[PDB]
Amino acid sequence: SQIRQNYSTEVEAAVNRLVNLYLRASYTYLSLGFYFDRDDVALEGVCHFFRELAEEKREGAERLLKMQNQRGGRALFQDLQKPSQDEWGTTLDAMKAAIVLEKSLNQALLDLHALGSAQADPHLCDFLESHFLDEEVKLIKKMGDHLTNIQRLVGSQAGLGEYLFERLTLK
């Protein structure tokens, strides 16, 4: 590549893996969204929340792919593994699973920053810092908040709690 400069094959490879993680997160959230749109679940605000996350994660992957090209790396695509579940249980189950997922994405971002740092690739480190690390931290805080409110509510009368959360907190 005529443009490639200070961009290691290790970072290129990790970037392609991170794109796959993001597309997979996006796929997971798509399945979460349409689960809550079922007539027997019917929590529209939960559906909108996860469908918005499907979009965000897809955008994350595209920004990674745009960056890969800017550096002269080569995008390599792999199979996208289907989500870990077909049914997601209650809002509480679903938000717990979403937090697990975001934490693993965040861990992958931190591992990539550490690689970039080891490879002395400051553009990589800045790119993650600017576009991904802060947004992951903000998102995980939001989910933890949600989880605290769902839990507070589904003490007595789980059904009432679940309806109230979706109506009064979710968009």
Query: Binding to its own copies (CB under 8 A): which residues in 137-166?
Result: 137-138, 140-141, 143-149, 151-153, 155-165
Should residue 71 be labelled a site residue for its own copies when binding is judged by CB under 8 A?
Answer: yes
Should residue 94 be labelled a site residue for its own copies when binding is judged by CB under 8 A?
Answer: no
Q: Which residue type is seen at 126?
A: D
Instruction: Please work out the total of residues on this chain that contact Cl ion, with binding judged by CB under 5 A.
Output: 1
Alpha helices (H) in 37-171, listed in sequence order:
44-71, 91-118, 122-128, 134-153, 158-168
Distance CA 105, CA 102 (A): 5
Interface with Fe ion in residues 53-82 (CB under 5 A): 55, 59
User: Is there a binding annotation on residue 55?
Assistant: yes
Interface with Cl ion in residues 3-32 (CB under 5 A): 5
Q: What angle do CA 16, 84, 26 make, to 5 degrees?
A: 45
Distance CA 162, CA 165 (A): 5
Nearest residue to Cl ion on Cβ basis: 5
- The residues binding Cl ion (CB under 5 A) are 5
Site residues (vs Fe ion, CB under 5 A): 55, 59
